[PDB]
Design a protein around this ligand. Structure first.
Ligand SMILES: Clc1ccc(OCCCNc2ncc[nH]2)c(Cl)c1
Length: 304
């Protein structure tokens, strides 16, 4: 009914704020991106540093894995995304088209496509093999904070400081849905649930909400943490108990019971804002990463 996540490893190496951490789908690796313009790879189970991947000319806000765990895509302040072959370290493609900072990115499950969101208020859909932009979506009227494909890649969800979450048809580019609550504070993060029936959205009023989007209504609300300034990732934890996991501006990792909405654990250790968390695909392992005054990544493990 409660997990018992405890610190196992602290991963040090980035020289500026860490922006994002993601587990490879095959569970072997952790990738991290940073304001220090670098991507670093780490052992998911031992926390052992593996390699550094370089090339962006400015800081990196996001990194994501392909489904086969062989490629990474990164989103940078240099207005580009880059596709990387992880084993060789080579930049396969540089995706050019955004006219300002690229803030978020993801592969679709088939991993033939990349979606990106930018400060330029647009969402773009890219072809992985050619590196060319397929669609530019006039998605929002403020910076785009997050983009995510659903389980079969037919849908994209985006969020923005303009207070909206929007659902897009991947194939046509048409806006299928706009989610409005009773109010519209900036939306700082969004992603589909594993089954694709729900979306989880963070707003900069210290609140996480679980939405049934097809019915366009809020089902759950998660509070207790602090989130008023940063685009903090949130996760569905599914390997053990069903949790909601998120970072917080009080330097803690918050874990909620998905159903009761109660806080079931708060992980202490970081010394600055926890901007990013990730959940291991098969083991009860959480990765967390923190901002400039901390710079470390932490690996936590629970027995349930
Ligand atoms: Cl001061 C500051 C401000 C922002 C930063 O990273 C961007 C936020 C985290 N990325 C993200 N959230 C959702 C999609 N990508 C960092 Cl590293 C430092």
């Amino acid at each position: 009914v409660k997990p018992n996540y405890a610190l196992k490893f602290t991963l040090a190496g980035h020289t500026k704020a860490v922006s994002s951490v993601k587990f490879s789908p095959n569970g072997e690796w952790l990738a991290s991106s940073s304001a220090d313009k670098l991507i670093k790879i780490w052992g998911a189970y031992d926390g052992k540093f593996e390699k550094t991947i370089s090339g962006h000319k400015l800081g990196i806000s996001d990194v994501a894995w392909s489904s086969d765990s062989n490629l990474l895509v990164s989103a940078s302040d240099d207005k580009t995304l880059k596709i990387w072959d992880v084993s060789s370290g080579k930049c396969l493609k540089t995706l050019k088209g955004h006219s300002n900072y690229v803030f978020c990115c993801n592969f679709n499950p088939q991993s033939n496509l990349i979606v990106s969101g930018s400060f330029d208020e647009s969402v773009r859909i890219w072809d992985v093999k050619t590196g060319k932009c397929l669609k530019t979506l006039p998605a929002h009227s403020d910076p785009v904070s997050a983009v995510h494909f659903n389980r079969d890649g037919s849908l994209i969800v985006s969020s923005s400081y303009d207070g909206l979450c929007r659902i897009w048809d991947t194939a046509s580019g048409q806006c299928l849905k706009t989610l409005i609550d009773d109010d519209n504070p900036p939306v700082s993060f969004v992603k589909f649930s594993p089954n694709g029936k729900y979306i989880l959205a963070a707003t900069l009023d210290n609140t996480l909400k679980l939405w049934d989007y097809s019915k366009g209504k809020c089902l759950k609300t998660y509070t207790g943490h602090k989130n008023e300034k940063y685009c903090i990732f949130a996760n569905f934890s599914v390997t053990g108990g069903k949790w909601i996991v998120s970072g917080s501006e009080d330097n803690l990792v918050y874990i909620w019971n998905l159903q009761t909405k109660e806080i079931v654990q708060k992980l202490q250790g970081h010394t600055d804002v926890v901007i990013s968390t990730a959940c291991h695909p098969t083991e009860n392992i959480i990765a967390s990463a923190a901002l400039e005054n901390d710079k470390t990544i932490k690996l936590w493990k629970s027995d349930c």
